Amino acid sequence: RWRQTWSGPGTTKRFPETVLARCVKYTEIHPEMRHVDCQSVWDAFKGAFISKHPCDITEEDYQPLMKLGTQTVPCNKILLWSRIKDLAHQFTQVQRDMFTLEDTLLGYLADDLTWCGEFDTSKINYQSCPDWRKDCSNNPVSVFWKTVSRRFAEAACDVVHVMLDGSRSKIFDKDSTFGSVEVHNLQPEKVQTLEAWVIHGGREDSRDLCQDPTIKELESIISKRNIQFSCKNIYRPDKFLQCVKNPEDSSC
Ligand SMILES: O=c1c2ncn3c2ncn1[C@@H]1O[C@H](COP(=O)(O)OP(=O)(O)OCC2O[C@@H]3[C@H](O)C2O)[C@@H](O)[C@H]1O
């Protein structure tokens, strides 16, 4: 108890109750998910990781949950993001111009949560969970997000948008979920353009970050997939959000 088994934070307190509650809330608000049996969803979620070694999780483990979580998303209004989720969420909340993964049942259920079990016992581990870096990448949380992010990217069509954090050292990071999963799962048959919005943090007079080497890398990767690339700087994210809320404004 002075040393834990794994290097990462343990399962979020009251995990089962939280997931169940989020599912009830989601299905009450969103009419197309109004029929989903939230007990069945919890049962499937549990089944993915309980009694399993938390370094031996596979995408197959989550297939029952994926099935129950089946959901149509407007394919042309998807917003992806990397390392900038708060702005992405504040943006979509104004008038639902776009949808992030957290606007789907499954993304909503898991957002900000951590979970894992133990091999050959049905107990949730509230003490520690595997860290992706130090322990193992095939852990319940990591495998969940890769699985759901892949399916989300596969559903996209027309123009897909991505918000990137321009204050980061690597504005586009090939090791992120966006860069390692979503970019490679957009379907060129369906997706016309990927448009990146590079969000400035250098506050109030800055460079053209669409010329950043990592952005040029992203452009190259997506161009070679037969998808067009566009990029825009958002210099003042505060002004941006205000203009979204009230486009009837002088600077907007
Ligand atoms: O929606 C989430 C999400 N919500 C919560 N999380 C998500 N990860 C990926 N996604 C999807 O991938 C990207 C973001 O992942 P990232 O590039 O690793 O950013 P990031 O590096 O900010 O993501 C950190 C992060 O936070 C958890 C997940 O455990 C994880 O790796 C988005 O486009 C989403 O569609």
Q: Delineate the domains of the chain, giving CATH numbers in brackets.
A: 1-72+100-155 (1.20.82.10), 73-99+156-252 (3.40.50.720)
Atom from ligand 1 closest to the CA of residue 162: 33
Active site residue 75: yes
User: What are the C-alpha distances in Å from 59 to residues 144, 151, 211?
Assistant: 7, 11, 36
Instruction: Quote the DSSP letter at residue 166.
Output: T
Pairing of strands 121-124, 117-118: antiparallel
Pairing of strands 158-165, 191-199: parallel
Experimental method: X-ray
- CA–CA separation, 161 vs 142, rounded Å? 23
Resolution in A: 1.7
Atom from ligand 1 closest to the CA of residue 84: 22
For atom 15 of ligand 1, the residue with the nearest CA is 177
Alpha carbon of 82 to ligand 1 centroid (Å):
7
Give SS3 for 149.
helix
| Beta bridge mates, 232 | 197
In the numeric block, which tokens belong to residue 224? 């070679």
Catalytic one of 38, 55, 136, 157? 157
Which residues approach ligand 1 with their CB closer than 6 A? Answer: 80-83, 85, 101-102, 107, 111, 141, 145, 149, 152, 176-178, 182
- CA–CA separation, 142 vs 6, rounded Å? 15
User: What are the C-alpha distances in Å from 106 to residues 43, 100, 102, 246?
Assistant: 14, 11, 7, 31
For atom 6 of ligand 1, the residue with the nearest CA is 111
Instruction: Give Cβ neighbours of residue 149 (< 8 Å, ≥ 6 apart).
Output: 101, 177, 181, 182, 185
Query: CA torsion, points 133, 138, 140, 141, in degrees to nearest 10?
Result: 40
